[PDB]
Symmetry: D2
Subunit: 292 residues, 4 copies
Amino acid sequence: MFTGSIVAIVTPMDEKGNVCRASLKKLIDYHVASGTSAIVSVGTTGESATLNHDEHADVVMMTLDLADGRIPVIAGTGANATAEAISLTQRFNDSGIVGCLTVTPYFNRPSQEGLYQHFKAIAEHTDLPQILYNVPSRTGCDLLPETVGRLAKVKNIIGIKEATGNLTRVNQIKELVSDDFVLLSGDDASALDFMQLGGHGVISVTANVAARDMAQMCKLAAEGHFAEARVINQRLMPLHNKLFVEPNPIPVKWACKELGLVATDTLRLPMTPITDSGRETVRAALKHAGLL
Amino acid sequence: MFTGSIVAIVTPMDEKGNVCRASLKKLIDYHVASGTSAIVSVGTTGESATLNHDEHADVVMMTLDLADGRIPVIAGTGANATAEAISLTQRFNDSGIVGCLTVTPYFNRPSQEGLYQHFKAIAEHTDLPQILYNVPSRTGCDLLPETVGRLAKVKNIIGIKEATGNLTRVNQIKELVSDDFVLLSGDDASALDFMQLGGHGVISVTANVAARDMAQMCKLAAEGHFAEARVINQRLMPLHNKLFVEPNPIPVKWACKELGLVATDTLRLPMTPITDSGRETVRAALKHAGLL
Amino acid sequence: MFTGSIVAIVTPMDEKGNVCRASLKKLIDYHVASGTSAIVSVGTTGESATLNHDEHADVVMMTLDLADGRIPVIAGTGANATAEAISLTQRFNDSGIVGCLTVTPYFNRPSQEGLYQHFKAIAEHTDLPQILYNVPSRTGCDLLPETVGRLAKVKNIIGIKEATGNLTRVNQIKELVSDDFVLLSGDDASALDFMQLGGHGVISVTANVAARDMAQMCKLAAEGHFAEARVINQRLMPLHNKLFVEPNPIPVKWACKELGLVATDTLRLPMTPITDSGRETVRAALKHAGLL
Amino acid sequence: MFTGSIVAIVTPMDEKGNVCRASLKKLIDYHVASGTSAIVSVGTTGESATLNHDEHADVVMMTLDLADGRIPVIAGTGANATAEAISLTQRFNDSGIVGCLTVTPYFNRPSQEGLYQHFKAIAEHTDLPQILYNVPSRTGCDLLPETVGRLAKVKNIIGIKEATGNLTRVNQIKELVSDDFVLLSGDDASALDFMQLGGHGVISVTANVAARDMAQMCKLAAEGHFAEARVINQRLMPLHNKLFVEPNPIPVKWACKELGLVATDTLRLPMTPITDSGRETVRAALKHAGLL
């Protein structure tokens, strides 16, 4: 599925910083029961940056096995070297994932032509559906609408996680792509606005801890009941904002632990444990959402 | 050692993207004869982003061997996962390098406390001198002066490549650190300004093609002869700007090839070949500097 | 009226830089015939900045007399000194204007409390309806949603021209105000997006030269036919963008002259005559819109 | 004259917002005794924005009279309409002032060519020396170095108050202008840096309350004694930052009142009284500087 509430799932870890199989299973049962439409495995919220590619692949496969056909799983496959993106993608060919979420190269700031060649080469080395992923504040570069339109002519490239928070992009991209191209918010706080402008869903951090509300918000959104969707959004808005009070996924892993969804809120450096003041801030947002 | 004109040397490649030993040898002989203070091997300009750690290590060792003790070599050792940075650093123990240049974690956007822990742990597990590297435009985070001051108390963290172009940072950092702590610009166009405010040198892209002028400019700067340094800087200023007309190191590799210093200007995806307009703009900057 | 396409009308001038009565009348007949819902007189596009308050008032009164009850007229009343805003507003009490468009103080960068006190004092010194006007790129300050919600409790303050281009503001403001509070785009290129999110119209530059298209776009928008509105918007998009190719109102006054709506495209310094390259750029956008 | 510590003097007011002659006299006597080079009368810090031109002129003439030849006075003469700036300038012919400080037109956002024509025409219709004033954060436009270079060829345009805080501008401007053209910082916190790069002085808010320290700091800077100047600057740095904790001149007027230098800290709307938190933050900065 590429519609409704898609969770960028945390990679729950034990105190040693390795994947915790029991916590992950508990999360996957929760999204199955909550109406979550799909799982993105080892996206940004899944700590793609601090897992090596082997550990990345193990978590994806584990996630897929635990999902057990009950919920589609999208693998994060981003790399800032194109050859490395191809290679990571190839680990998942013929695996069972329904598609790949692939980020604009970070750090080396390619040109728009570089971005075209990067994603085009990735798409040509796989049969899997490809969701582009733009997040300039993290990467240092910005996959503009013109270039997305160009990449959408690749049969294999089928959508975009747009995480700028810049809502004008929804209709600038939509003009240049076919009606089958999927537009997903990558920014929880603006995602309902995004869907009202014609977006088809959200790859969400908030959905890690408020999976039922989020699934119901996007359903209402897709049916055109935007006023009713907003009541849920206002309930979730403190969470939309305060889950980034400290760098993601520090707040959401703590929140998961507080809700009993995971055993520990451990992260890998350079991500650090939530501060005392961060706990209070996130606790309060959870209370506002009616969860704690 | 860690003052003067330090070159962020390109990793010259053949048509297939593999390191070209003969061209690398030409570049190193050219830096030895042109008075360059040191070579940073596999920094950003050296395509750290698109070499795997094994290729990264080979290029560094080849640079060491070719240098043959005539010029000091600093290895790039940056990674956005702490355990990965520690582990890459370990590959250079007893190698001959005089130091490491280590970037703030990119993409994952850690807090200041996260950056402190990142660099503290790296420093703890080596005897090699560490030069911090801050470049928010690429990374998505910004290592503030206060945090540089904490890190400078570690015996082993000896300096910073400040690549913001924000010149207020020179004296904000300097007043928080000892007189031995080295401040190096990572922004060619504002580098003379940086040194005039109290900086000790530059880690430079321009130096790849204007090594002599750069060495003389940084010496005059250290002697307080800023007017005489400015005259050199005025003729290098088109290169300072236009080596970034297209993503670095696309223009500088083309310039090295135009001068006959490397056999090919090949890069690795997602870097793309220079466009014709960029070709003309860079050739004009080379002639301004008196190099063609 | 505070709905549909509202024109921020140019103040057409003779070659001496004074208001040209015949050109203004021609414009007002045109908006009457075109379905324009209202005229903003001596807004930013009307060169509020280079007319003194007497000349400002004369143009407003002239505009009102020429409108002759056929089309509502809103007076620009902005000033960066609160006492001057009150005084300018008072010139129009009992005049026939339906309301005032009043900008956040520019240059002196008040706090949010300063903005509250500024607009509250203005509203208390008049019976006229007040439309707030936020445009940070011009003023140096940003009237945030929280403060707008606070000001909306004033009976007299009834809407906002939101000219940030930041679409998240539509629903942030809407949560905090009553359903009677009017939300108007001040940014032509995003205005349809703005209305789709729940905005009620636009105070528009493009409507100066494409008044029929704009009136029909906002009507379709208010009826929920957004796909049909977009066809018009795409036709108008080059104009939406290229009317700011040079500082407003330089391009739109030239365009008006080209369409025979005004006699001269003269402006007051520091606004300068359109450049040759600007004419070609605007001519092409007019051709795209099907007007030239 | 136009080097050293130049104070952007507050316009002290009584409870009703009218100039307080006795307090203004205290301030002027204090600048004469503290070694201040000149007074800018009715600049930004002097509330140019909220005095009408008649009150603006009175305050300048009163400042001239009270100074009584002991200290030079530069009048603020900025306006965003060219004919208005010319006309305000004319009020100061044969007045005794040594020069005018004239800001880039705010709000209307003119092109570089517009700014050239704006300032050229002002300069043409007076014999008074003109100091250009660039502050994009307030105005919405930015007078680039290239345009400063054109304007410097006018016999009558003699310098610039560069208030961006972007220190690269010092040597970009300097290399395009003659050695006689004066470069003055309009940003207290980066002013020592500015002078160390080649600037000749500062038009200063801090000088209102730390006149002596400021005068000594700028002298040492002009003598090349930057380390000795830095020590003074380190103790004034909290004031440099915290005089802008709330909109200028709210904090500095409160500070002048705390020191006993003015009778009231009253401002004109839309400036508002200092908050309690701002009170404590500014009192801490005053004690850091050794003033209470």
